[PDB]
Design an enzyme around this catalytic site. Sequence first.
Site, short mmCIF file in Angstrom:
data_model
loop_
_atom_site.label_atom_id
_atom_site.label_comp_id
_atom_site.label_asym_id
_atom_site.label_seq_id
_atom_site.Cartn_x
_atom_site.Cartn_y
_atom_site.Cartn_z
N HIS A 14 0.86 -1.17 0.00
CA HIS A 14 0.00 0.00 0.00
C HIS A 14 0.90 1.22 0.00
O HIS A 14 2.06 1.16 0.43
CB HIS A 14 -0.87 0.00 1.25
CG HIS A 14 -1.82 -1.15 1.32
ND1 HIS A 14 -1.70 -2.15 2.26
CD2 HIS A 14 -2.91 -1.46 0.57
CE1 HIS A 14 -2.68 -3.03 2.08
NE2 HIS A 14 -3.42 -2.63 1.07
N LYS A 56 -4.42 -0.43 -7.97
CA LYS A 56 -5.67 0.38 -7.86
C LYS A 56 -5.38 1.52 -6.91
O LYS A 56 -4.33 1.51 -6.33
CB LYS A 56 -6.86 -0.48 -7.42
CG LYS A 56 -6.80 -0.99 -6.01
CD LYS A 56 -7.94 -2.00 -5.84
CE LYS A 56 -8.13 -2.39 -4.40
NZ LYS A 56 -9.21 -3.43 -4.34
#
Length: 220
Positions: A85, A115
């Site tokens: 992340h 994403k």
Amino acid sequence: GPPQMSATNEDLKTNFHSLHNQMRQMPMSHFREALDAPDYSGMRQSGFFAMSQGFQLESHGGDVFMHAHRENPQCKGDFAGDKFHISVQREQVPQAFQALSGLLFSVDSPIDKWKVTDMERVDQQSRVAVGAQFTLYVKPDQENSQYSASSLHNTRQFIECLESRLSESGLMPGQYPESDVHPENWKYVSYRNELRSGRDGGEMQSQALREEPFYRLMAE
């Protein structure tokens, strides 16, 4: 029972010593940034289907992310749970996207699929809104789902480049997700493995994650 085993991870254990020592002998990676990538607001308009730099783009009413994945993946292995992340300040996501798009759409990027949260739709207090606004999916490069030393090195170098671009582009770090681990020298990036940790986990899974061979190859 025990944590979920993977052939990818067992190979990393068997070859751990050789892998990190090979990586240490390799010179810096060279990532040619993409010019002409979408901006953040544009990527929201991908709807059903759009393309940039060989990445298929998607953003439609089902979930709260916008997705990019190579039409022709560079990594031929099956996903083995390794993911990163990236956490920036909640109000700076569009600026972070602009700072990172050169790398995320690069012909040289080792990341086939990623994403970014849609900040207009997400719950503003979500763990993927206050941080972890980008998710990067790592895949072993070889058809046998094993990581090569070259691919591991390129991935580690890529993360260090994401960090450098964020810093020099003036982005503030966000709130890292409690699920993940990161070393002192990563100000924006963090890691977990999907097979052997949960997104709703916390400090109780930190030691296990710090012991993941893939993480150690990225961070140690």
